[PDB]
Symmetry: D2
Subunit: 122 residues, 4 copies
């Protein structure tokens, strides 16, 4: 739900995700990573299912962060794909792909894959 | 500069990606999939490295599509992570994650992974 | 180490992994899944780094299970890629790819991606 | 029957995969990578569906290579998951996970993901 997703969330690495869920299915916010070649906040944009299934199914969503801001540029971008599970202890469970810009020769090793779990703070 | 990301692209499945890259790193556009539980166009939003390295590296980028529009709702979302390589034959090489909203018991098989290659040739 | 990997392990879904680490870097054993189109034990074979780095780095390994045994055939195969972290509480952290045999037309949705964490039992 | 998996295959990077498929589902052979921290041949072991569906589906399979041999040790392992499609131009289409042994603090970037297509044409 927009109100359920909107808020501040943190993942197991200590990174911060601040997001606003729009009525049209849009997600905008900022992300601050606790690891990597990153410093300060980065803009994020994404989309979510604004009319999810009325059962105990999660709400599918995804967002992207290109790691360039006014202080640093890592020449990479990460996309998180997952689902929001609301409730008393709402969590957003994701898997992500982090691609670095590389020359053609090194393209085979351009993408890392991982998973992050986010917990919402009050 | 010289980032011919803006335009209409097609992937190996025949899906159509129409995007506009903003000078500050935003990607906005529509996606029409030739496969899956989809019909017509869907809104996409993403981010890209607006200041890539000056060596022969590609430009990292990523975008998301929540598969809900006025015609259908598949209760899923896809994120594409990859890089743009320009020149005579430009391409956007990506790997994607498609997550469907599931119940807790089916969460283990909620995500599909694949790769798409886009060109401006139909 | 072979002795550290050898044993019975269980993951968060309740599946059982029984493996033997060979001196030559081989892994053989059986796997019993708590979910999916599976019943009883399946043969698994894999490889691991038998001469890992002497620091607090994990030992890289991987294994495969084709989901066909004498009782059932799911026409799929899963490969787990990860690292073994030994100690008092040794764990094997992995990410996996599960591919189903499909017709060419449905190949785009043939592979699921996920992650499993295994705990060793005494 | 009619599974021409046994043989020498090459992927788009020029790597060589030599495998023997056993009547009961085992895959054994050697791998020589054209890229990465590798030299010469490495042992691989895997599994495949020895009784695939009788519809036009591919045969699911997977294999692992731990990158240690008498010449080098990269302290990593790769697992390829995919399916074999036979006919005039047979192919093995795969997605892979390459995990490097890391320390706990770098575990988040321990795994690379990519895709390789193998053909019997050099
Ligand atoms: O190093 C880079 O290329 C940019 C920073 C990457 C940080 C990654 S994104 C996925 C994972 N989850 C996080 O919170 N941070 C790391
Ligand atoms: O079936 C669904 O859940 C929605 C449509 C999914 C279409 C996918 S997204 C990745 C791949 N690339 C495409 O162009 N289409 C498929
Ligand atoms: O349903 C199938 O196609 C065969 C069974 C798949 C079980 C999967 S493998 C990855 C995940 N981890 C497990 O322990 N079981 C599921
Ligand atoms: O660099 C390493 O850690 C060992 C060599 C990795 C080679 C990889 S495995 C996936 C991809 N496919 C290949 O044929 N080679 C690269």
């Amino acid at each position: 739900a927009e109100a359920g997703i909107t808020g501040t969330w943190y993942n197991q690495l200590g990174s911060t995700f601040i997001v606003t869920a729009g009525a049209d299915g849009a997600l905008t916010g900022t992300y601050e990573s606790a690891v990597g070649n990153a410093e300060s906040r980065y803009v994020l944009t994404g989309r979510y299912d604004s009319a999810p299934a009325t059962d105990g199914s999660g709400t599918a969503l995804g967002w992207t962060v290109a790691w360039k801001n006014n202080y640093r540029n890592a020449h990479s971008a990460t996309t998180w794909s997952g689902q929001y599970v609301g409730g008393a202890e709402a969590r957003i469970n994701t898997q992500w792909l982090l691609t670095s810009g590389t020359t053609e020769a090194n393209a085979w090793k351009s993408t890392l894959v991982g998973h992050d779990t986010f917990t919402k703070v009050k």
